[PDB]
Amino acid sequence: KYERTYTTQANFILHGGDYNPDQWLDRPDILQADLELMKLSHTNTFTVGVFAWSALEPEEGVYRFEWLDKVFDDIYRIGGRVILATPSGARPAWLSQKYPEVLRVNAARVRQLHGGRHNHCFTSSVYREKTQHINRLLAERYGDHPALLMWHVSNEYGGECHCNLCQEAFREWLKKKYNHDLDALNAAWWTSFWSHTYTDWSQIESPSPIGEHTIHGLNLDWKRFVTDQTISFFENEIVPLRELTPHIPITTNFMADTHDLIPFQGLDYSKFAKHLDVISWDAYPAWHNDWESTADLAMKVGFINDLYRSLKQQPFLLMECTPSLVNWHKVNKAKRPGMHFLSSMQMIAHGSDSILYFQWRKSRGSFEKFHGAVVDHDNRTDSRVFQEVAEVGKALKKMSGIVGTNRPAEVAILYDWENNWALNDAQGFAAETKRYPQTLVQHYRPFWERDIPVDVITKEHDFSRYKLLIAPMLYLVSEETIARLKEFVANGGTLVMTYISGIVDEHDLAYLGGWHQDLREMFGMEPIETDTLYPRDRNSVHYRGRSYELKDYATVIKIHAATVEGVYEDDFYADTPAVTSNQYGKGQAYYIGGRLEDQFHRDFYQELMEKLDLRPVLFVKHEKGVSVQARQAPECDYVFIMNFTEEKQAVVLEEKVKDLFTGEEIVGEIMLDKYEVRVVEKRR
Amino acid sequence: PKYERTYTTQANFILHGGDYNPDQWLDRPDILQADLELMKLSHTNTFTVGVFAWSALEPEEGVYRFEWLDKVFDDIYRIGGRVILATPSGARPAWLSQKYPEVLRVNAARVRQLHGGRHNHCFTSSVYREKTQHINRLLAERYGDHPALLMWHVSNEYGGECHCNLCQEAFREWLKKKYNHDLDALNAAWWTSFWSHTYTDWSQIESPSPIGEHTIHGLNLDWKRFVTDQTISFFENEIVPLRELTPHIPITTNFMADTHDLIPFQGLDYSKFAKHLDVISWDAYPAWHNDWESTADLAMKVGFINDLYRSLKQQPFLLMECTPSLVNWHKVNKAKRPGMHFLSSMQMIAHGSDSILYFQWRKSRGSFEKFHGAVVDHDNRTDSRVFQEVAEVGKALKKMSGIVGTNRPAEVAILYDWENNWALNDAQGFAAETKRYPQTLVQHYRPFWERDIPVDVITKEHDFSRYKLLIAPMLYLVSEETIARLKEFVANGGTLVMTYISGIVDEHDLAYLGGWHQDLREMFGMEPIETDTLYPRDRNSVHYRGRSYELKDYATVIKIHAATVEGVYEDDFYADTPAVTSNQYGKGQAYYIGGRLEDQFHRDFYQELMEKLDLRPVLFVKHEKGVSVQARQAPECDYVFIMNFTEEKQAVVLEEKVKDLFTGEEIVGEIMLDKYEVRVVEKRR
Ligand SMILES: [Zn+2]
Ligand SMILES: [Zn+2]
């Protein structure tokens, strides 16, 4: 099909980002300069009002919208658009002072004072009332303004409250979940252990470092409630948005948890996604760090992109990146010349219809005054950051055909938030080596190196759309999910699972009496022991004429109908099966019993690539470090050839294509400089 | 004026002794008797009494026990000694905490503390201000005219903060004064529009907190300033009766360094506190013989702090505390090796101290510091190596009374700023672990120490014009006013050196807008446009005077105007662009060093400045690295200390002849120094 699917009314790639004139109302000269600089930076879309509550309502019921009126008209006049934010991300001081109930109580049951941001009690009726009301005012005043493009609801939702109100909300939530049956809750959580059985709903409290933290069922269900109540707060926020502005798409900005760029762990975005119109996220890779290559980092970014793109199977919106550096890393090193362009192109390549920044103009003071922005304190255009921002903008202006385009994949990696939660909470294995999302990226690596399109999906997605489904460490899995995987393989799908998959149900309750019969039958084997190793421990697995290094985990395997593809070579399970395959119905299922070195995954997945005919959208010959990614329109392929190394790289096109920017025809060998990106069109 | 002596106390001798706590031994007249005899044998003469003696002075409220202290004053006087009398506010009795809980601190997390420890009173409480002032008054009434009384030791190691509602209100009143009750001004200064933090009533503003607001830099900064001010106010309150009843008695309080790298104490702005004291005094606990640096590097750090604290009031300072052996609270409590105590004491005198004072005289039998070093061990022996080396120091000091009150003018200044330290440390940016501001200053001190060139480490509260060479590294925060002073300084012939991450931010931690401040741009004939922050494994290099020098941590991209390019970067995207610049401005010169460069760079750079400006030691002595030569100057003569801070024999060469202050022997030419040996030498002017 390849039919374009737009997420906003914009038929151009958005460029710009967080704009905060509310910090400059006393500086009209700066405000005027902004418009001209926006034109010079080729930016067109600005996210306004994320923390402007005290600017909009300096005193309770006393409103000041005129500065905002003016910002709307001015941005419209230069041909810009506004992404309007609701301001719930930071309550005014007056509000905390008059309504203390909006201040959080943390898990150690300490009531917080006013300060910071993103930290309201998510249950408080007052904060729900106020936020919905100011949202209603905003939607009334600006809803049909021609500059408006999208709603940016709150900012970076996350965190928890453990106040009395929240305790009660949690009790009600549990009553709904377990159908008011305390026996069912007790059974699910296995509270007979350490005499924790609850005999009244009133007894149940959120987990705490000074209370109860030894009940996994309580811990998991608490995380679930935190997600549901967050989403509830959001719905309450958007009621006036849906009533008065049904024509305006709604998003909220997702995060990656620091360093490894893993999915945000504080909220189940797979559940949140269903409540949004378009997915948006905030990406802050620590480019040029000294513990990994540029390629590894880019590969991680690519993975997160494939995840947030896949949530709604439609273009996503990069809501935030820094055009230079951040303020809050251990080392706030700036992007090198070329790296900003490269990173931006990579966002487009994995499905983004925007390049948006935090921030437009560096705050003169306070916590993020040294966070990167388009415009430095010097107010110069004569700046490498500003110039490279302008170059990205000029490029995007030529890429409007890519807007709304999709990019189907034959390969999916299954990720599961609740599984991540339950696995991290589990007392077992080795705390420091569980590393679930990182492991997923290790299975992503061979496909990234081969430029094979991947979806990172959740159990909410249709499995059958794929030739290959990879589910590492699916430790927590429900019988429903199991049944769907069973169906997937039986109908012809290829399924790969690993060590520490299928241990536990959705209650974190161990599956009893051996492996679940469906898994045992699909895989033609079953795990009987997980061997957890110390850091210096090693094993190896011999596979296709090669011995591959094993660290961290091994699985003793009992064979039923399965073929043994590889074996362990040391320890008490030396020469026992380590890697298996099994024909099940029209499909196949592979078990990888140990954590093996990169080359193992290269060689193992190469076989499935050949067997299942997994190809890149457009083949490009290149060394490691060069990423080729594509987006597909009905009449053409758009292909990004990206040099994520600090060397020149020779690449080869086997087919003629057109440079998207210059029009130039191109085929054969070409040279990319360090961080160079070529964007090409190939006619279909 | 001409090198004239300036005496800080009535003593014409170098104080030797330290904290004396007979209040812990009142049931042991044998120990108190032995104390006096051993005081004679150790040649100690000055003792700090009463530092934690409140509970001994007022065992219950309104019930006093001064007789034991009377006998202490008389007894110490009898054997020819003096008393530094301390006020006891350093630790309140348990009855006081119990009856008046308002004196207990509320920490940053808003937890009320229980009674215990020390140094930890609420600095706002009217009750504690009144009780401490009153007992101070009883003390001055009773001992003020006693001949043994030498100096007041007000409280002990001031430090810490309180966040109780009393303190919140006092902070609010402080802020109203500072900003002229103008909430717009406060909100503008702190940039509170960011994250919707704008305050619409003074009652909303509270101190920063781990469970509240810790993301507003201006609030954090102003809170530290208020902590300093409120501490000083408490001090003034303490000393009211001391001024009334004993105006002729000098007042001090003991300062600290902050652990490991011996950096200036970070808890209080001493450049502000110094103005309130008659004399500066401080407590030195270097971790001698540690396994991570040479004895020479540590000694250099110590000398840096000495230069700082001497320079605060540009007069001799008083070493109030050091250990004659080991301490109790270090991760590794290693004792001084034989000779090291003598050496370190001499170093203290050489950089300006008119005292060698210990903590403590006699080891505590129990509690937290029962294993802290002291002159007298638990065995009460004079046979002790510690006792003997203390005695040797005493014997040496008795021959050194001519050094008392001598000063030591320097032609080189290093500018340090407490508020800059605060603001740079709190800032979100650069790299947390590599900012290392005070350490960096020590890096710039290093070549001058290695050349025995006298250095003042000054604050913006000082006359810049008195120096040839002013070194102000990483002056991230700086006011318009200080900038103007710098400008004048260079214009009238001053030579100024600044570095990366200097002049970024004003006194509100508000970023200077629109490029570098005009005055600085003009002065240096260049401007910084980008600060490159590097990862630990990252490296660069600067080519300068024909050599490559290694760069780590920070680089600065530089735009040239009138300035001469002296050195350039050699790698990364700013390769072959300027890293080191010089610029003539009016009668003076301004140098900018763009990157953080290895030791040898500073050696060569500053060597050139030393030749250029004719920077010399007071007396040249030829020696290898790790021998420190430092001097004090009298009208009639120079007193020169030649100190071997290495663990080996050391050949040293005097070109002019001098007289050994201990033996009278005239010496000249080569001299061998054994390990840790000091030579104290006199040269007639
Ligand atoms: Zn709550
Ligand atoms: Zn207080």
PDB file of C-alpha atoms and ligand atoms in Angstrom, chain A residues 121-123 161-163 165-166, ligand 1:
ATOM      1  CA  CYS A 121      -0.111  14.751  43.364  1.00  0.00           C
ATOM      2  CA  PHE A 122      -1.870  12.909  40.497  1.00  0.00           C
ATOM      3  CA  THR A 123      -4.989  12.233  42.610  1.00  0.00           C
ATOM      4  CA  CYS A 161       2.401  10.159  44.977  1.00  0.00           C
ATOM      5  CA  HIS A 162       1.825   8.169  48.180  1.00  0.00           C
ATOM      6  CA  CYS A 163      -0.443  10.607  50.020  1.00  0.00           C
ATOM      7  CA  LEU A 165      -5.743  10.489  48.738  1.00  0.00           C
ATOM      8  CA  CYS A 166      -3.550   8.308  46.525  1.00  0.00           C
TER       9      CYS A 166
HETATM   10 ZN    ZN C   1      -1.260  11.967  46.146  1.00  0.00          ZN
END
